[PDB]
Structure 1
Amino acid sequence: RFTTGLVYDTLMLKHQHAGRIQSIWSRLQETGLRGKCEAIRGRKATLEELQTVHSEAHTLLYGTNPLVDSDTIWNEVHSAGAARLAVGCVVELVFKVATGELKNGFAVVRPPGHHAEESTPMGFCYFNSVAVAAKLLQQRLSVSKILIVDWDVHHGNGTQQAFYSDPSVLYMSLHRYDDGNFFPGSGAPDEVGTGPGVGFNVNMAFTGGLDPPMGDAEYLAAFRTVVMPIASEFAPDVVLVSSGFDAVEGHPTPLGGYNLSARCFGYLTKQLMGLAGGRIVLALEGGHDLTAICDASEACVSALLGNELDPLPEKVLQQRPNANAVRSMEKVMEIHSKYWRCLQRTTSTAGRSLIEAQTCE
């Protein structure tokens, strides 16, 4: 059926008392959303597929079985094996959407991938699943234009690295930055790409700390002023999302700190669905509060299926973005007005609420 796809595999589970992916899968079952989707069969990525992004030595070290107590080193060996499986699960879903076998999809996968660099694992990431999917779309299907949006609260340093000189992949990261003082320390607004890729790396970097925390109004405004204008101009053929949910309320000060609602991610998904004819796949990255990530996963899948979304509260729709967010947005727009026509014509309305922007448009 031409509908929303899912990928999940119990071989990614730590114990071989529900973790993140098992809790997300259960929510999708209980809500009936799983029943409306096509769950596909995953597989291991090949060593060759992993090597579109990573070095041979890196792939051989972490991608090969050496031949489980979760408190022993063999937990990490298993996590690296789980990563190899996660990459193949994401690749399979991405290809089924990109070929039109399925409409769109959500990959319920772990570990996350977006921090893993060419020959360096880090931040719980061994292999960059989303980047590998994107490399294979280019190499195997000659996809002309790919948008990667990364809305995990931490900068996707691996994904930025993988495509930094490539103008055929637009990488857009929304993340807490605070002038270099938040993990992993990369993703300054000034980082715009290199070579022919100049202008095709967009760091929507929030600065100013938690005075106050960023919330729905701030992210909605960032989508309005930076993400959607730039993404629309680019006009991608396929959209991939590194969908971390650690920006949702309930994630404390270093491993989070923002107070987005799960409902807001549904709306952010629906916005991205207006691009690439609806050819969009989300892949789980970070987030750890089980209620928050299950709520968020539910909102996103519901949106992908075309279900009517729970309205955002009137308060959120009427809220002007906080001063630090406005400053952050305006710095990014200023930098990227050099490369994008949608940022050259105008004056900033980043300080308007959604309703005000709508009224005044």
Structure 2
Amino acid sequence: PITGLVYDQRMMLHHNMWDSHHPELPQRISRIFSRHEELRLLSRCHRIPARLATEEELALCHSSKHISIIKSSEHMKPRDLNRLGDEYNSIFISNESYTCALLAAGSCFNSAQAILTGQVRNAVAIVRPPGHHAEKDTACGFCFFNTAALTARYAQSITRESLRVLIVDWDVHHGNGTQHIFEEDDSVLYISLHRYEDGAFFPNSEDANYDKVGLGKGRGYNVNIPWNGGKMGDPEYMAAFHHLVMPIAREFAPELVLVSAGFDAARGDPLGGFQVTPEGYAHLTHQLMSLAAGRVLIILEGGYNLTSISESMSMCTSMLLGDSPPSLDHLTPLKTSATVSINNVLRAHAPFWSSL
């Protein structure tokens, strides 16, 4: 069994012209890549080439107007780049942003293709800018195009329209864009765990609550696991996976698993305030590998402590390669509010999933 890896240094060119120290740094992906080399993980993987997504591929999820506007940023003057960035919630743009976003999506397309055609069993994509806040018609939260959602649609386009795709989003923030793109869809099961705080955490919408279960034929195929009341870690994520993510995922029986793998719930993250450990992320990865004949693609989203994300994603790759899961700490008892959250989600999703 072969693990694939895609990384292209050109995705470092997207940058914040107003604040060179903004945490969504080019060095996020180069530090992760260097750690894969130091831990001798990189040489164990099949190297998947990056490529640009095409505009027809972007149109699987995004409107013609959104694609055109972001594409035009490649040729804008600084004053226009500044004005364009201000037309979105939490976006900075440079002349290289569009190309980097194309590279991030196209890299994931090549990895999903490699997985689905049997060239590799599973794969990891070290990409930026991230994707899961991007909506059909707008950029948001450092995301221009929704890489994970696009990869699900691309995978369906090269197999069959009904290919069952699971997206697990363990970035600390809700993937509002991914939820909305698939809200009415029963072919793509979206499961997000995220810091919620009764709506007082980015992206600041009640769409992230546990009672948003999907719409129409998609009812039951949107699973929000919202955390409230302080710092969650390995015990809470392991419990949510044990009682919610994996039972629902097994009943759905995905043919492809995409992980929106932000590492901003990691211990040490300056923005997330949580303390999932690298061993925790290894155990989450190892559980997902029991799905979909092992067809798992791990896609970088957020995560802003350079050392934490480098250790955390390297631990995921080590699991994909088949290494034994590392020992976890003594798991402290579940925090009270996490028990509440799990009970709320179970109650909301019991109508739809007999295994609950």
Tell whether the 8 Å contact from 2:33 to 2:126 is kept in structure 1 after alignment: yes
Out of 146, 166, 179, the residue aligned to residue 147 of structure 1 is: 166
2:300 maps to: 284
Q: Could you state the TM-score of these two structures normalised by the residue count of structure 2?
A: 0.90
Question: Are 2:268 and 1:250 aligned?
Answer: yes
Give the secondary-structure state (helix, strand or coil) at the position aligned to 2:186.
coil
Deviations 1:152-171 (A, max 9, x none): 00000111011110011100
Report whether the alignment pairs 1:191 with 2:212: yes
Name the structure 2 match of 1:274: 290
Distance 1:63 1:237 in 2: 33
2:130 corresponds to which of 105, 109, 112: 112
8 Å Cα contact 2:14-2:129 kept in structure 1: no
Q: Secondary structure at the match of 1:77?
A: coil
Conservation of the 8 A alpha-carbon contact between 1:62 and 1:81: no
- 2:17 pairs with 1:6: no
Higher mean alpha-carbon deviation, 8-17 vs 273-282, is at: 8-17
1:223, CA displacement in angstroms? Answer: 0.4
- Secondary structure in 2 matching 1:341: coil
Instruction: Select 1:182's aligned residue among 201, 207, 216.
Output: 201
Task: Find out whether 1:161 has 2:180 as its counterpart.
Answer: yes
1:121 to 128, 139, 150: 139
CA distance in 1, matches of 2:142, 2:112: 22
After superposition, residues 1-361 of structure 1 pair within 5 angstroms as 2-14=1-13, 19-64=27-72, 65-66=74-75, 73=82, 76-142=94-160, 143-186=162-205, 187-207=208-228, 209-210=229-230, 213-252=231-270, 255-313=271-329, 315-316=330-331, 319-343=332-356
5+ residue gaps, structure 1, are 344-361
Q: Gapped runs of 5+ residues in structure 2?
A: 16-24, 83-91
SS at structure 1 position matched to 2:191 = strand
1:50/1:159 CA distance change after superposition, 3 Å: same
Secondary structure at 2:198's aligned position in 1?
coil
1:100-156 Cα offsets, whole Å, 9 max, x none, are 111100000000000000111010000001111111112221152110000000000
Q: Secondary structure at the match of 2:258?
A: strand
* Mapped partners of 2:334, 2:30: distance in 1: 35
Quote the Cα distance in structure 1 between the aligned partners of 2:93 and 2:138: 19
Q: Deviation above 3 Å: which 4+ runs of structure 1?
A: 15-18, 72-75
Question: Does the CA-based 8 Å contact 1:164-1:197 persist in structure 2?
Answer: yes
SS in structure 1 at match of 2:217: helix
Q: Aligned letter for 1:235?
A: A
Distance 2:236 2:209 in 1: 18
1:312 to partner: Cα distance: 0.8
TM-score scaled by length of structure 1: 0.89
Please tell me whether the aligned partners of residues 216 and 260 of structure 1 are also in contact (alpha carbons under 8 angstroms).
yes
Q: CA 1:67–1:332 in 2, change beyond 3 Å: closer, same or farther?
A: closer
The one-letter amino acid paired with 1:115 is H
CA contact (8 A) 1:63 1:84 kept: no
Give 1:18 deviation, angstroms: 6.9
Between the aligned partners of 2:77 and 2:328, the Cα distance in structure 1 is 44
Q: Flag the 1:111–1:309 CA change in 2: closer, same or farther, 3 A.
A: same
CA deviation map 1:302-350 (0-9, x unaligned): 000001232112x12xx2211000001000000001111011xxxxxxx
User: Structure 2 vs 1, CA of residues 59 and 75 (structure 1 numbering), >3 Å: closer, same or farther?
Assistant: closer
Percent identity over paired residues: 46
How far is the alpha carbon of 1:179 from its aligned partner?
1.1
Deviates more, 1:138-147 or 1:270-279: 138-147
Q: Are the aligned partners of 1:86 and 1:110 in contact in 2 as well (CA < 8 Å)?
A: yes
Partners of 2:132 and 2:9 lie apart in 1 by 21
Q: Cα distance, 1:15 vs. partner? A: 7.5
Structure 2 Cα separation of the partners of residues 219 and 298 of structure 1 = 19
Counterpart contact for 1:176–1:205, Cα < 8 Å? yes
Flag the 1:248–1:67 CA change in 2: closer, same or farther, 3 A.
closer
What is the rounded CA distance, in whole Å, between the counterparts of 1:244 and 1:168 in structure 2? 23
